[PDB]
Amino acid sequence: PTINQLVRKPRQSKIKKSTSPALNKGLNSFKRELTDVNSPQKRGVCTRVGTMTPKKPNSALRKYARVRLSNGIEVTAYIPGIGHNLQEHSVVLIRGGRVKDLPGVRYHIVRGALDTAGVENRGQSRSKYGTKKPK
Amino acid sequence: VMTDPIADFLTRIRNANMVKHDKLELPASKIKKEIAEILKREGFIRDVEYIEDDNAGTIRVFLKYGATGERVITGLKRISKPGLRVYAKSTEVPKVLNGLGIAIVSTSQGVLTDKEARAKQVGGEVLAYVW
Amino acid sequence: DRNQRKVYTGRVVSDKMDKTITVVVETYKKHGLYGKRVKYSKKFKAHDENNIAKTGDVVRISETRPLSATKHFRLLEVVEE
Amino acid sequence: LEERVVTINRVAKVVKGGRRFRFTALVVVGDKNGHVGFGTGKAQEVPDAIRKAVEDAKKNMVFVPTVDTTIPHTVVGHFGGGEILLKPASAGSGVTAGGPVRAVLELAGVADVSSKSLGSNTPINMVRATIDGIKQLKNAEDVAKLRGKTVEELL
Amino acid sequence: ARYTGPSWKVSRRLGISLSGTGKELERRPYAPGQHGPTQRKKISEYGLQQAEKQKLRHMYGLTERQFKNTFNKAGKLQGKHGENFMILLEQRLDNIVYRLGLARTRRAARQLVNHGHITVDGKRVDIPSYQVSVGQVISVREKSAKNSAIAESLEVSSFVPEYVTFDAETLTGSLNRLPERSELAAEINEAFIVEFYSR
Amino acid sequence: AVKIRLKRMGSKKKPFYRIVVADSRFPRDGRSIETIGTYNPLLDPVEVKIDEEATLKWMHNGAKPSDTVRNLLSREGIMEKFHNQKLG
RNA sequence: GGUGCAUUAGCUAGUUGGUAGGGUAAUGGCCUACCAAGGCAACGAUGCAUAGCCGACCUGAGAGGGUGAUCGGCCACACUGG
RNA sequence: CGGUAUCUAACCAGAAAGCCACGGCUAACUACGUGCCAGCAGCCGCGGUAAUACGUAGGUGGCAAGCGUUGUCCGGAUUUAUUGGGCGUAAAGCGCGCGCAGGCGGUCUUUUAAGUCUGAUGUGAAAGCCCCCGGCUUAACCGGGGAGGGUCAUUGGAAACUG
Ligand SMILES: [Mg+2]
Ligand SMILES: [Mg+2]
Ligand SMILES: [Mg+2]
Ligand SMILES: [Mg+2]
Ligand SMILES: [Mg+2]
Ligand SMILES: [Mg+2]
Ligand SMILES: [Mg+2]
Ligand SMILES: [Mg+2]
Ligand SMILES: [Mg+2]
Ligand SMILES: [Mg+2]
Ligand SMILES: [Mg+2]
Ligand SMILES: [Mg+2]
Ligand SMILES: [Mg+2]
Ligand SMILES: [Mg+2]
Ligand SMILES: [Mg+2]
Ligand SMILES: [Mg+2]
Ligand SMILES: [Mg+2]
Ligand SMILES: [Mg+2]
Ligand SMILES: [Mg+2]
Ligand SMILES: [Mg+2]
Ligand SMILES: [Mg+2]
Ligand SMILES: [Mg+2]
Ligand SMILES: [Mg+2]
Ligand SMILES: [Mg+2]
Ligand SMILES: [Mg+2]
Ligand SMILES: [Mg+2]
Ligand SMILES: [Mg+2]
Ligand SMILES: [Mg+2]
Ligand SMILES: [Mg+2]
Ligand SMILES: [Mg+2]
Ligand SMILES: [Mg+2]
Ligand SMILES: [Mg+2]
Ligand SMILES: [Mg+2]
Ligand SMILES: [Mg+2]
Ligand SMILES: [Mg+2]
Ligand SMILES: [Mg+2]
Ligand SMILES: [Mg+2]
Ligand SMILES: [Mg+2]
Ligand SMILES: [Mg+2]
Ligand SMILES: [Mg+2]
Ligand SMILES: [Mg+2]
Ligand SMILES: [Mg+2]
Ligand SMILES: [Mg+2]
Ligand SMILES: [Mg+2]
Ligand SMILES: [Mg+2]
Ligand SMILES: [Mg+2]
Ligand SMILES: [Mg+2]
Ligand SMILES: [Mg+2]
Ligand SMILES: [Mg+2]
Ligand SMILES: [Mg+2]
Ligand SMILES: [Mg+2]
Ligand SMILES: [Mg+2]
Ligand SMILES: [Mg+2]
Ligand SMILES: [Mg+2]
Ligand SMILES: [Mg+2]
Ligand SMILES: [Mg+2]
């Protein structure tokens, strides 16, 4: 563009898109409106516990959960590790991170932080999956 | 030449350098008069001749090539243009190729290079880079 | 030693009011990011004691105390009519 | 000479019976005094490809001017989709350059240069672009003789 | 001291003797671990620069958060960045005690400066990072200048570098001048440290 | 009630005051009119610095000192000079 | 001098100016009586959304981008309205 | 604050090290178990019977009283390009014209000083960044002096370029 063309109507850059849109929304009950607060974690109650099959070319049976957050937003999470104690109407803590195989999943349940517990007989990478020191 | 007589004068030289011409002529002016002389002083060209005409006269610039046919001028450009003028403060007068080139600045003490413009503690409008 | 006041100059634009005029002042600011000299134009109100001026004249105005709701300049002198 | 390989690429041509593979190796060769060159060679085994490139490279030497352990001024190389600007740096600052543009500056014997590749990042064109910039590079005594001046008068 | 662990395997992984000459590379001069007698590998540009930062900081045995901090304040000095960065390391209290011959190894000088056995200008110093200056009388506390360890560590020791003057009778020393980058081991390519901290 | 007093600086348990002239209203460490000197109460023979020309210029304009600064202006022989200043 | 929107184009009726007066520490449509019909806007008025402002802070080769927690200056507020 | 900082004496190596990574980007490897299962994943992508990519042990590598994960901002991103990009075929020339405002404008002389350059005076508080000194056993931290920072105001000059 000419300099004059760029004085009458300057340059406006593209805007960024958040990968975890349900984590930067807060709630307050009095005004019944959604607030704009960035938060590393949120907690909610899991309403459905089960599995689905991943997309090609993977073929395992992946465990998931359907939680209802503390701002009212309904999202789908993923349970890492081997074996979980989660049932319906359990209280879990959730965090960002998208699993590529599972289509709708965008969050990722943190283990050992709340009613959900750490994996049994874990020896390495043990701070993840939240299990204590064997010694 | 319709909006810049000075960019036309600069771009005639660059066009004639490429095909290794030995001479070019163009309509004259008072400011193109001063640029041609500055160049001659630093040995960028060989000589300048002025011709009287009916209206405004012309000017002939004798391009200089070293031995083995190696060009003396590597390139030119225009800095302050009608769509956007640039003026340089006394300490903002730039160095071109770490002094291996020159810059032509139009100070209040006439048209000068960047070498002696900052030796007089003056600034002005920056016209061109020649290296 | 006595302190001074700001003085401007410009063109009368309208005379449709009683005992006052409307001068316009133009200057060459530069744009913030591209550094191009752009025109700036802000127009004032001046106290015309006796309707001296006419539209399109060149006049000088000097600052005073607030004389009305908007006017706070006085007509100092006229140059070109 | 102190050759340094840059990239080894495995290309293929498909034939009526299938694909026939090959290896192309890019090599930069130079001595730390100020001469450097590059070459390429295609063969069917990696050690065979390298030998051809070194033999090819030793016939394309170019000279770099290195006033005060640095390049004289700043230049921008340009070859196809590859573009690279070189700028002198202060003494003791090391070589600040990318993958294949650093190879031709360390081999050439330069110590203090900064650069940045503004175009594509194909190794074959990031070496042509750097060598092109080396061409436009010229010392003070060389300019002084051309313009009929003295080195003292210029600076 | 701070790296309370084996010292031979640090040299073997890096490939140079951090404790004098050949003392820990006489037998098995290859990297530690299960492998090392098997084969070697090809070092990348990252591995070439990262293997020389580790040559310095394990030579003086100081942590990373302190290695980086002293690299920035050497960047405000006159001269060349890597040149200055290496004379500051030579100027810590540990090295100065080690240079004089009071200790066999820097891991012994550090455990000596730590406990207060040395005095600078008649005052106790309980810390090893004290950045000593030119012409400060480095001495030993007049309560333990008879210990067998320090006495056994002088005769069994080497000569003295030029930039330090030491009296075994008076147990005193001083930095006569700062070195000029040629006095030390100079086995480290200082340009790779400076390039590494700009990646 | 313009007056000259001390503004507390330095770290915890290591005070260092800065002799300043300010109103009686603005906060202890807040806005002031100008700074005159320093006063280090920790080392034994106290180190104090005074302008010697601004302070006298201020005491004439009604800027009464505080309790401690009067002592500091006493040992300096600068509050005696104000007494002879009025008599002369 | 420092913001987003035209998928917000007209806004204004003590509003713009004048003559006499009242009021205030003080000039002034600040308020009043009479006369007049002006004034602002594509150099963005009007409306909606959002936000306390700055010294400064983080990043960057720089030009810039993002922020206004701690400490200092100014403003505004004190359950909501007068 | 408070018998707090600091100092002196007697005896103990005795009470005081974890965290995640090891296909490549990226420093750093082999055994056993499982067999498109269980599972890993930031991207490329790994698991179907020899898995340096899943799980454990041995061994290594980066940090270290911390080490990782997640969220948010700048960088890399020349990916809004004034510095610093483009439009024949990759995204990108209005279907074409007449024209208001606006942007830009051939040669020479005299004059003005709005833009431009320059000298002096006033100011841009303290703290912060930076430079030079000094005090805590060093450092962080804390003191003293300075520098920088304005399309800033008043005032005096220059006349090459734009008006
Ligand atoms: Mg992006
Ligand atoms: Mg989105
Ligand atoms: Mg993620
Ligand atoms: Mg205005
Ligand atoms: Mg080109
Ligand atoms: Mg191109
Ligand atoms: Mg190398
Ligand atoms: Mg620490
Ligand atoms: Mg530097
Ligand atoms: Mg730096
Ligand atoms: Mg005392
Ligand atoms: Mg703001
Ligand atoms: Mg009145
Ligand atoms: Mg009033
Ligand atoms: Mg009316
Ligand atoms: Mg109207
Ligand atoms: Mg309009
Ligand atoms: Mg509103
Ligand atoms: Mg609101
Ligand atoms: Mg608000
Ligand atoms: Mg950048
Ligand atoms: Mg900045
Ligand atoms: Mg900003
Ligand atoms: Mg905050
Ligand atoms: Mg608060
Ligand atoms: Mg105010
Ligand atoms: Mg207030
Ligand atoms: Mg109030
Ligand atoms: Mg309340
Ligand atoms: Mg013992
Ligand atoms: Mg893992
Ligand atoms: Mg892996
Ligand atoms: Mg594994
Ligand atoms: Mg281990
Ligand atoms: Mg380890
Ligand atoms: Mg950018
Ligand atoms: Mg984009
Ligand atoms: Mg551009
Ligand atoms: Mg493009
Ligand atoms: Mg499109
Ligand atoms: Mg197209
Ligand atoms: Mg067409
Ligand atoms: Mg049209
Ligand atoms: Mg027109
Ligand atoms: Mg003209
Ligand atoms: Mg003219
Ligand atoms: Mg300040
Ligand atoms: Mg601050
Ligand atoms: Mg000190
Ligand atoms: Mg400080
Ligand atoms: Mg200071
Ligand atoms: Mg004149
Ligand atoms: Mg003239
Ligand atoms: Mg004149
Ligand atoms: Mg015009
Ligand atoms: Mg003119």
Tab-separated table of N, CA and C in Angstrom, chain E residues 4-101:
chain	number	residue	atom	x	y	z
E	4	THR	N	28.210	-33.564	45.679
E	4	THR	CA	28.756	-34.606	46.546
E	4	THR	C	28.594	-35.951	45.844
E	5	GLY	N	29.475	-36.197	44.880
E	5	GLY	CA	29.433	-37.415	44.107
E	5	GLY	C	30.772	-37.743	43.481
E	6	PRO	N	30.821	-38.820	42.699
E	6	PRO	CA	32.085	-39.223	42.075
E	6	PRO	C	32.600	-38.164	41.116
E	7	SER	N	33.925	-38.067	41.027
E	7	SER	CA	34.571	-37.072	40.183
E	7	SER	C	35.216	-37.642	38.932
E	8	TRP	N	35.625	-38.911	38.944
E	8	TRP	CA	36.266	-39.483	37.765
E	8	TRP	C	35.304	-39.555	36.591
E	9	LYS	N	34.065	-39.980	36.839
E	9	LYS	CA	33.125	-40.169	35.745
E	9	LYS	C	32.716	-38.856	35.101
E	10	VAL	N	32.824	-37.740	35.821
E	10	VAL	CA	32.566	-36.442	35.210
E	10	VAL	C	33.607	-36.144	34.141
E	11	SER	N	34.879	-36.406	34.443
E	11	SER	CA	35.932	-36.206	33.455
E	11	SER	C	35.774	-37.158	32.279
E	12	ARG	N	35.450	-38.420	32.557
E	12	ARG	CA	35.367	-39.418	31.497
E	12	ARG	C	34.254	-39.092	30.511
E	13	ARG	N	33.116	-38.606	31.007
E	13	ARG	CA	32.038	-38.209	30.108
E	13	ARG	C	32.453	-37.027	29.242
E	14	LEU	N	33.132	-36.044	29.831
E	14	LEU	CA	33.539	-34.868	29.072
E	14	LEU	C	34.797	-35.116	28.249
E	15	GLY	N	35.724	-35.924	28.754
E	15	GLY	CA	36.896	-36.310	27.999
E	15	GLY	C	38.172	-35.573	28.333
E	16	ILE	N	38.160	-34.688	29.329
E	16	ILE	CA	39.366	-33.996	29.758
E	16	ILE	C	39.518	-34.179	31.257
E	17	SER	N	40.750	-34.032	31.728
E	17	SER	CA	41.059	-34.206	33.140
E	17	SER	C	40.766	-32.898	33.864
E	18	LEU	N	39.723	-32.902	34.691
E	18	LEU	CA	39.342	-31.724	35.455
E	18	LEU	C	40.200	-31.521	36.692
E	19	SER	N	41.044	-32.487	37.037
E	19	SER	CA	41.798	-32.488	38.283
E	19	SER	C	43.282	-32.651	38.003
E	20	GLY	N	43.798	-31.848	37.078
E	20	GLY	CA	45.213	-31.878	36.773
E	20	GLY	C	45.514	-32.471	35.416
E	21	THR	N	46.123	-33.655	35.393
E	21	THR	CA	46.456	-34.301	34.128
E	21	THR	C	46.367	-35.812	34.275
E	22	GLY	N	45.590	-36.438	33.393
E	22	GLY	CA	45.585	-37.879	33.215
E	22	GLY	C	45.267	-38.719	34.434
E	23	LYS	N	45.009	-38.077	35.575
E	23	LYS	CA	44.843	-38.817	36.820
E	23	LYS	C	43.637	-39.744	36.773
E	24	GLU	N	42.567	-39.330	36.099
E	24	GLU	CA	41.340	-40.109	36.016
E	24	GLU	C	41.061	-40.615	34.609
E	25	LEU	N	42.049	-40.570	33.718
E	25	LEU	CA	41.896	-41.110	32.373
E	25	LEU	C	42.975	-42.132	32.036
E	26	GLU	N	43.727	-42.613	33.027
E	26	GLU	CA	44.765	-43.601	32.756
E	26	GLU	C	44.160	-44.911	32.269
E	27	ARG	N	43.157	-45.414	32.977
E	27	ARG	CA	42.469	-46.642	32.612
E	27	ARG	C	41.041	-46.307	32.214
E	28	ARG	N	40.584	-46.895	31.112
E	28	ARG	CA	39.230	-46.699	30.611
E	28	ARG	C	38.966	-45.228	30.308
E	29	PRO	N	39.562	-44.674	29.253
E	29	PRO	CA	39.293	-43.277	28.876
E	29	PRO	C	38.081	-43.144	27.955
E	30	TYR	N	36.913	-43.525	28.462
E	30	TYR	CA	35.683	-43.433	27.691
E	30	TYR	C	34.532	-43.139	28.642
E	31	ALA	N	33.394	-42.766	28.061
E	31	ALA	CA	32.266	-42.268	28.832
E	31	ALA	C	31.774	-43.324	29.820
E	32	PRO	N	31.190	-42.909	30.937
E	32	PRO	CA	30.753	-43.860	31.957
E	32	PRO	C	29.454	-44.542	31.547
E	33	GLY	N	29.047	-45.508	32.357
E	33	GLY	CA	27.789	-46.193	32.154
E	33	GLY	C	27.971	-47.546	31.501
E	34	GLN	N	26.830	-48.205	31.291
E	34	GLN	CA	26.821	-49.513	30.646
E	34	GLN	C	27.570	-49.487	29.325
E	35	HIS	N	27.303	-48.489	28.496
E	35	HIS	CA	27.983	-48.332	27.228
E	35	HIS	C	29.266	-47.532	27.431
E	36	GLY	N	29.962	-47.257	26.336
E	36	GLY	CA	31.228	-46.572	26.389
E	36	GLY	C	32.360	-47.429	25.861
E	37	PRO	N	32.426	-48.693	26.286
E	37	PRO	CA	33.261	-49.655	25.560
E	37	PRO	C	32.628	-50.136	24.269
E	38	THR	N	31.348	-49.841	24.042
E	38	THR	CA	30.671	-50.336	22.850
E	38	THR	C	31.008	-49.489	21.629
E	39	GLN	N	30.651	-48.208	21.658
E	39	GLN	CA	30.865	-47.343	20.505
E	39	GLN	C	30.648	-45.897	20.927
E	40	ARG	N	30.965	-44.990	20.011
E	40	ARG	CA	30.745	-43.563	20.173
E	40	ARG	C	29.647	-43.109	19.217
E	41	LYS	N	29.413	-41.801	19.188
E	41	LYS	CA	28.353	-41.229	18.376
E	41	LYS	C	28.855	-39.958	17.705
E	42	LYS	N	27.973	-39.333	16.932
E	42	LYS	CA	28.280	-38.099	16.223
E	42	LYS	C	27.632	-36.926	16.944
E	43	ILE	N	28.434	-35.920	17.274
E	43	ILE	CA	27.985	-34.784	18.069
E	43	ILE	C	27.430	-33.708	17.149
E	44	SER	N	26.284	-33.153	17.531
E	44	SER	CA	25.623	-32.114	16.761
E	44	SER	C	26.181	-30.743	17.130
E	45	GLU	N	25.636	-29.701	16.499
E	45	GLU	CA	26.011	-28.341	16.870
E	45	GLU	C	25.565	-28.020	18.289
E	46	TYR	N	24.355	-28.442	18.661
E	46	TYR	CA	23.913	-28.289	20.042
E	46	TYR	C	24.829	-29.027	21.003
E	47	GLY	N	25.216	-30.255	20.656
E	47	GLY	CA	26.053	-31.036	21.542
E	47	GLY	C	27.474	-30.536	21.636
E	48	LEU	N	27.942	-29.796	20.634
E	48	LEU	CA	29.295	-29.258	20.687
E	48	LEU	C	29.386	-28.050	21.608
E	49	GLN	N	28.373	-27.185	21.594
E	49	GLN	CA	28.373	-26.028	22.478
E	49	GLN	C	27.995	-26.407	23.903
E	50	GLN	N	27.030	-27.312	24.062
E	50	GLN	CA	26.600	-27.720	25.392
E	50	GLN	C	27.650	-28.566	26.095
E	51	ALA	N	28.583	-29.153	25.354
E	51	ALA	CA	29.641	-29.937	25.967
E	51	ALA	C	30.818	-29.094	26.420
E	52	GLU	N	30.820	-27.792	26.136
E	52	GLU	CA	31.882	-26.924	26.619
E	52	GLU	C	31.456	-26.005	27.747
E	53	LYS	N	30.171	-25.672	27.847
E	53	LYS	CA	29.678	-25.076	29.079
E	53	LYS	C	29.893	-26.025	30.245
E	54	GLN	N	29.628	-27.307	30.031
E	54	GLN	CA	29.807	-28.310	31.064
E	54	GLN	C	31.271	-28.568	31.373
E	55	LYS	N	32.187	-28.118	30.515
E	55	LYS	CA	33.606	-28.241	30.816
E	55	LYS	C	34.050	-27.199	31.831
E	56	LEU	N	33.488	-25.990	31.759
E	56	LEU	CA	33.814	-24.957	32.734
E	56	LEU	C	33.136	-25.208	34.075
E	57	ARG	N	31.806	-25.308	34.086
E	57	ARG	CA	31.102	-25.280	35.363
E	57	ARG	C	31.392	-26.517	36.201
E	58	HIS	N	31.729	-27.645	35.576
E	58	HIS	CA	32.248	-28.763	36.356
E	58	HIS	C	33.719	-28.626	36.703
E	59	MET	N	34.449	-27.726	36.052
E	59	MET	CA	35.828	-27.506	36.466
E	59	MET	C	35.876	-26.771	37.797
E	60	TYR	N	35.018	-25.768	37.966
E	60	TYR	CA	34.916	-25.036	39.219
E	60	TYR	C	33.805	-25.550	40.124
E	61	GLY	N	32.932	-26.415	39.621
E	61	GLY	CA	31.937	-27.085	40.443
E	61	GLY	C	30.856	-26.203	41.029
E	62	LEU	N	30.395	-25.206	40.285
E	62	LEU	CA	29.348	-24.316	40.756
E	62	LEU	C	28.087	-24.490	39.918
E	63	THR	N	26.938	-24.315	40.567
E	63	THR	CA	25.649	-24.650	39.986
E	63	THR	C	25.331	-23.755	38.792
E	64	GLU	N	24.223	-24.070	38.124
E	64	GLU	CA	23.863	-23.347	36.909
E	64	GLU	C	23.349	-21.948	37.215
E	65	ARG	N	22.467	-21.814	38.208
E	65	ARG	CA	21.897	-20.510	38.524
E	65	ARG	C	22.959	-19.508	38.936
E	66	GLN	N	24.117	-19.977	39.382
E	66	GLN	CA	25.229	-19.092	39.679
E	66	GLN	C	26.172	-18.941	38.500
E	67	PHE	N	26.300	-19.983	37.678
E	67	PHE	CA	27.094	-19.890	36.460
E	67	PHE	C	26.507	-18.868	35.500
E	68	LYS	N	25.186	-18.869	35.342
E	68	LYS	CA	24.552	-17.920	34.439
E	68	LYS	C	24.652	-16.495	34.962
E	69	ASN	N	24.490	-16.302	36.272
E	69	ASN	CA	24.500	-14.951	36.825
E	69	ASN	C	25.846	-14.277	36.623
E	70	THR	N	26.939	-15.002	36.866
E	70	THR	CA	28.262	-14.422	36.675
E	70	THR	C	28.623	-14.263	35.209
E	71	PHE	N	27.867	-14.875	34.301
E	71	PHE	CA	28.090	-14.665	32.877
E	71	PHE	C	27.532	-13.328	32.414
E	72	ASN	N	26.448	-12.858	33.034
E	72	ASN	CA	25.860	-11.587	32.630
E	72	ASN	C	26.690	-10.409	33.116
E	73	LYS	N	27.190	-10.469	34.347
E	73	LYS	CA	27.959	-9.357	34.886
E	73	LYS	C	29.361	-9.277	34.306
E	74	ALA	N	29.849	-10.351	33.691
E	74	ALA	CA	31.044	-10.267	32.866
E	74	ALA	C	30.762	-9.633	31.517
E	75	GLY	N	29.499	-9.522	31.132
E	75	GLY	CA	29.107	-8.896	29.894
E	75	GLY	C	29.010	-7.396	29.941
E	76	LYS	N	29.315	-6.790	31.086
E	76	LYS	CA	29.348	-5.342	31.225
E	76	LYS	C	30.765	-4.810	31.363
E	77	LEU	N	31.768	-5.641	31.116
E	77	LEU	CA	33.162	-5.288	31.318
E	77	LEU	C	33.823	-4.886	30.007
E	78	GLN	N	34.960	-4.212	30.133
E	78	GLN	CA	35.741	-3.834	28.966
E	78	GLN	C	36.363	-5.065	28.321
E	79	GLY	N	36.334	-5.110	26.992
E	79	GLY	CA	36.993	-6.186	26.276
E	79	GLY	C	36.051	-7.157	25.598
E	80	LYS	N	36.381	-8.444	25.646
E	80	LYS	CA	35.621	-9.483	24.969
E	80	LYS	C	34.878	-10.341	25.984
E	81	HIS	N	33.661	-10.750	25.619
E	81	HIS	CA	32.740	-11.342	26.586
E	81	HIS	C	33.292	-12.631	27.181
E	82	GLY	N	33.701	-13.572	26.332
E	82	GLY	CA	34.235	-14.822	26.841
E	82	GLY	C	35.550	-14.658	27.569
E	83	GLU	N	36.386	-13.723	27.116
E	83	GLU	CA	37.653	-13.455	27.783
E	83	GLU	C	37.429	-13.026	29.228
E	84	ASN	N	36.544	-12.049	29.438
E	84	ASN	CA	36.276	-11.557	30.785
E	84	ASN	C	35.591	-12.613	31.638
E	85	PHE	N	34.705	-13.405	31.039
E	85	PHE	CA	33.939	-14.374	31.812
E	85	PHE	C	34.834	-15.414	32.458
E	86	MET	N	36.000	-15.678	31.879
E	86	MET	CA	36.863	-16.711	32.424
E	86	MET	C	37.835	-16.190	33.468
E	87	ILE	N	38.127	-14.888	33.483
E	87	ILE	CA	38.985	-14.356	34.536
E	87	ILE	C	38.204	-14.110	35.818
E	88	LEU	N	36.889	-13.910	35.725
E	88	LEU	CA	36.067	-13.812	36.926
E	88	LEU	C	36.001	-15.145	37.653
E	89	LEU	N	35.918	-16.249	36.909
E	89	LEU	CA	35.922	-17.563	37.541
E	89	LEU	C	37.244	-17.831	38.242
E	90	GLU	N	38.360	-17.437	37.625
E	90	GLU	CA	39.664	-17.641	38.242
E	90	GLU	C	39.839	-16.832	39.509
E	91	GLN	N	38.942	-15.893	39.774
E	91	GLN	CA	39.129	-14.901	40.814
E	91	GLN	C	38.283	-15.175	42.049
E	92	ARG	N	37.472	-16.228	42.039
E	92	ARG	CA	36.733	-16.616	43.229
E	92	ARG	C	37.693	-17.013	44.344
E	93	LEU	N	37.171	-17.066	45.569
E	93	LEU	CA	38.025	-17.403	46.700
E	93	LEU	C	38.475	-18.854	46.664
E	94	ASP	N	37.638	-19.760	46.156
E	94	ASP	CA	38.042	-21.160	46.048
E	94	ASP	C	39.283	-21.314	45.188
E	95	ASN	N	39.258	-20.742	43.986
E	95	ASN	CA	40.368	-20.940	43.068
E	95	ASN	C	41.642	-20.312	43.611
E	96	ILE	N	41.533	-19.124	44.211
E	96	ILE	CA	42.713	-18.445	44.737
E	96	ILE	C	43.363	-19.270	45.839
E	97	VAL	N	42.557	-19.874	46.711
E	97	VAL	CA	43.111	-20.767	47.723
E	97	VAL	C	43.748	-21.983	47.066
E	98	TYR	N	43.085	-22.544	46.056
E	98	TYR	CA	43.628	-23.706	45.359
E	98	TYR	C	44.917	-23.364	44.622
E	99	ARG	N	44.974	-22.189	43.994
E	99	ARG	CA	46.177	-21.800	43.265
E	99	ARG	C	47.382	-21.726	44.189
E	100	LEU	N	47.202	-21.161	45.383
E	100	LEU	CA	48.313	-20.998	46.314
E	100	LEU	C	48.873	-22.329	46.789
E	101	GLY	N	48.123	-23.412	46.648
E	101	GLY	CA	48.579	-24.714	47.076
E	101	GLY	C	48.139	-25.129	48.457
